[PDB]
Amino acid sequence: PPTNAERLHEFHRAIGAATPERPTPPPPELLRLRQTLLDEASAEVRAEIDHLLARQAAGEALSAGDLAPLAHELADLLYVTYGALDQLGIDADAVFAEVHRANLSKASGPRRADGKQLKPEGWRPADVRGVIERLQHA
Amino acid sequence: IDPFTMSDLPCPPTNAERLHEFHRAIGAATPERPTPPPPELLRLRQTLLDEASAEVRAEIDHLLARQAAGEALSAGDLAPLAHELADLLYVTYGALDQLGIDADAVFAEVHRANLSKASGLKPEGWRPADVRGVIERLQHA
Ligand SMILES: O=c1ccn([C@H]2C[C@H](O)[C@@H](COP(=O)(O)O)O2)c(=O)[nH]1
Ligand SMILES: [Mn+2]
Ligand SMILES: [Mn+2]
Ligand SMILES: [Mn+2]
């Protein structure tokens, strides 16, 4: 069963712009393009969250159906974020698994006042350099 | 499984299912089905999305500066950017998970529309992504 990362690979092949299979340093125009796509998708999510917060400040009780535009824009952001990893030739699932393992290890840490999970004493970061080296050879 | 099961090798978890595991582990809200959020949850999700976006941008800028000055970039030089892009995935999935919205279901519908459009400009009979229908269907699962 395909992953969302593999879906992006299929999409790029379908638009005739097949992407490398292994990590590949990109030309500058590729980085600038991916940055623009990330910024526009981030701005759409940001605007929608501000929009929902303003409705709540007005006293409206949101329903689940009110969440459809935000869910759509969040998925569009996933699309362009996976898309950036795919055009770099970087297996997003392998990097994500490393990041996830180093996030589960934060469970014993304290929380910030806004709810952000913080790092416990002694915590050590994900080793994404090692994942990249793993993907680069085989 | 039952006494007849002689092997059990499940499909690996999706990245969306990983966010559910993380939020369970840290005691954060992770509803099974779509759930309107308190404003405090929306504010946190915004903060994490802004923070992760800023970190990605910082790493893209570092790469552009190094290659501008002639540096030969190896695959290993992409590791900070890849880490920050994975963090951005993480908090984007994380917002969908805290809303009780199956990110894989929503992504699959966005992908269906995007992949369909690539076979056309739109092909005949093209249907845009119907995320509203996905959330309704998730409510009745
Ligand atoms: O409340 C939290 C705190 C951290 N993270 C994940 C997202 C990133 O992968 C990474 C960011 O953590 P910091 O490095 O900013 O502390 O942890 C969350 O998803 N929710
Ligand atoms: Mn969009
Ligand atoms: Mn980060
Ligand atoms: Mn951070």
Side-chain angles (χ1 to χ4, degrees), chain A residues 4-90:
Chain A
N4 294 337
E6 292 162 353
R7 294 184 165 90
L8 254 301
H9 197 75
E10 155 181 56
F11 177 76
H12 283 143
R13 157 247 290 150
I15 62 173
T19 47
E21 217 71 20
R22 289 173 194 263
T24 301
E29 57 271 17
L30 182 45
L31 288 166
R32 289 185 223 105
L33 173 54
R34 298 319 300 193
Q35 177 75 83
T36 307
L37 289 166
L38 290 172
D39 287 337
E40 289 188 5
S42 290
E44 298 252 74
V45 169
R46 179 177 302 110
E48 184 58 31
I49 294 176
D50 285 333
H51 164 90
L52 297 174
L53 283 170
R55 290 165 62 176
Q56 292 178 311
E60 183 182 356
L62 303 178
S63 67
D66 294 318
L67 302 180
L70 177 56
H72 190 157
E73 301 309 336
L74 286 164
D76 281 347
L77 182 55
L78 291 178
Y79 218 83
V80 293
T81 305
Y82 276 122
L85 287 159
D86 189 66
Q87 293 202 324
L88 294 179
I90 294 166

Side-chain angles (χ1 to χ4, degrees), chain B residues 80-137:
Chain B
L81 175 59
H83 190 154
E84 302 298 345
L85 287 165
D87 279 349
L88 182 59
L89 292 175
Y90 211 93
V91 298
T92 304
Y93 278 120
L96 286 161
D97 183 72
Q98 292 219 270
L99 296 174
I101 295 163
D102 181 347
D104 292 327
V106 177
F107 189 97
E109 172 67 6
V110 166
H111 180 61
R112 180 205 57 74
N114 286 344
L115 184 64
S116 175
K117 197 202 234 206
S119 73
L121 299 187
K122 339 273 195 66
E124 280 227 297
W126 182 71
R127 292 183 297 118
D130 176 21
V131 175
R132 171 164 308 285
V134 176
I135 283 142
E136 296 177 1
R137 188 180 330 279

Side-chain angles (χ1 to χ4, degrees), chain A residues 116 119, chain B residues 48 51-52 55 84 87:
Chain A
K116 182 179 186 182
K119 293 150 181 170
Chain B
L48 299 173
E51 175 183 0
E55 287 152 1
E84 302 298 345
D87 279 349

